[PDB]
Design a protein around this ligand. Sequence first.
Ligand SMILES: C[S@@+](CC[C@H](N)C(=O)[O-])C[C@H]1O[C@@H](n2cnc3c(N)ncnc32)[C@H](O)[C@@H]1O
Ligand SMILES: Nc1nc(=O)c2c(CN[C@H]3C=C[C@H](O)[C@H]3O)c[nH]c2[nH]1
Ligand code: SF4
Length: 230
Amino acid sequence: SMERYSHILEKDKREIVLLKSRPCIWGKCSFCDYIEDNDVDQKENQKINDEVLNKITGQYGVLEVINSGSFFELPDETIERIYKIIGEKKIKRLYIEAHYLYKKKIKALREKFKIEIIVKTGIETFNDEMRNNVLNKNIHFDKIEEILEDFDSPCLMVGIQGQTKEMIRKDIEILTKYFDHGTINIYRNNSTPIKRDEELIKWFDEEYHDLKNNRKYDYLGIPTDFGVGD
Ligand SMILES: C[S@@+](CC[C@H](N)C(=O)[O-])C[C@H]1O[C@@H](n2cnc3c(N)ncnc32)[C@H](O)[C@@H]1O
Ligand SMILES: Nc1nc(=O)c2c(CN[C@H]3C=C[C@H](O)[C@H]3O)c[nH]c2[nH]1
Ligand code: SF4
C-alpha cells in the first residue's frame, strides 16, 4: 500500500501526510496522474484519512498536508480533524496546497486556522504559454505580486520537453527574488504523454547545484523524496 505518513528531515523539519480527496476541481493538467488517488466517495476518504491523521504528533510543531489536489477537496470531517489536531498537538505552522482557482478561499481559511499557513500552489513555470498552453494549468495572473496576495510557495517543475534554459533560468530568478518558500520538482515520466528532457535535467543538476542546499526551497530530484506517495 501507499506511504501516507512521513517526516521531512531537512530545512523546515515537519510531519507530512498524503490524504485522499474528491476529484480535483480542475483535473486537466496534461502531465498530472496524481489524481488517480482521488475518490468521489468522501466517506471512504475520511475513513482512510483518519488512520493517517492518528499518526500526527506535532513533534516538530510543523505539519504539511498534501492530497493530490487542493486542500479544499478534503472531506469536511478530515479538515475539521486537522483543525482539532493543530490545537491539540500545538502545531504552529501548516503547509497546504491549493490550485490558483481557489485563490479567493484562502483568506477565510487563514482566519479559521489562525496559525501560520504556508500555501503552496502548482505554478510549474512562470512562462505563461508553457504553463497554460502546454501544461494546461489554467493559471492566469497579470503580475507576480498578484500571486503573493494569497499564495506563499510556488511548486516549479524542471525538465520537461519544450522547456528551454532561458525559461528555467527565469523561473529561478523569479522564485528567488519574490518568494520566501518554494519547491523545485525534477520532472518524472509517468502515465501521461508529457516527457522528461534529459539534457535540460542534466544541465540543471550541475548549473543549479547550489539550489539543492538553499534553506528556503525544498528540492525533490524524485517525487518520492518526502517519503509519501509512489
Ligand atoms: C497537487 S499538485 C499542486 C497543487 C494544486 N493542485 C495545483 O496544481 O496548483 C502537486 C505538484 O506535483 C508536481 N508534479 C506533478 N507531476 C509531476 C511529475 N510527473 N514529476 C515531477 N513533479 C510532478 C507539480 O509541481 C504539481 O504542482
Ligand atoms: N498521488 C500522489 N500524490 C502526490 O502528491 C505524490 C508525490 C509527492 N508530490 C509532492 C511533492 C512535491 C509537492 O509538494 C507534492 O505534491 C509522490 N507520489 C505521489 N502520488
Ligand atoms: S497538477 Fe494540481 S490541478 Fe493539475 S490535475 Fe494535478 S492535482 Fe489537479
